[PDB]
């Protein structure tokens, strides 16, 4: 690849659209070139939650699927930094939704969205409905967190989207089992029906 630019990456993160545009108009920077930590302009724009910049960079046909050294794409940055407007735009542009977000548990993009933003969780499932049942590194899906700590309405949401109650985590437990362990009688009753 060609030259990367610290000034561009910083302007993208900080949200300075005029500066991004002035730097890109020179056609001297390879917009897909990765810096020393694997970061691109798009990852910086997404991490900083800068929709206008992200839209501009998408108009230049940047690669959506480059990963930084932590293994995250621009979409994972958007979701983990609560930039759900950016996440939506990236999903629309065809960004891969079947990815893992950074952290010890290896949660799926879907699991992180399901905890934080229902609309993005639905956008993800519209792309690949089987992600509802894709487990993290402990063998748990989104249903397990709700079984422990959530409410019967949350159980209903995930079951309506196809959550499979029979799935077992790496300890051999179902969502019903973890509800019972957590003394969550309401979710246990909802899972039992």
Author numbering: 26 to 218
Task: Give the published text.
We demonstrate that endopeptidase complexation by Bd3460 prevents cell wall decrosslinking, and that both the Bd0816 and Bd3459 targets bind this self-protection protein via a common epitope. In summary, we conclude that we have identified and characterized the first ever self-protection protein encoded by predatory bacteria—ankyrin repeat protein Bd3460 from Bdellovibrio inhibits the prey wall decrosslinking enzymes Bd3459/Bd0816 and in doing so protects the predator from the shape transition that this catalyses in prey.
Firstly amino acids V126 to G131 form an extended loop that differs from the usual tight turn present between the fingers of the other repeats of Bd3460/standard ARPs. Thirdly, the repeats of Bd3460 can be grouped such that AR1:4 and AR5:6 stack with a regular angular periodicity, but AR5 is twisted with respect to AR4.
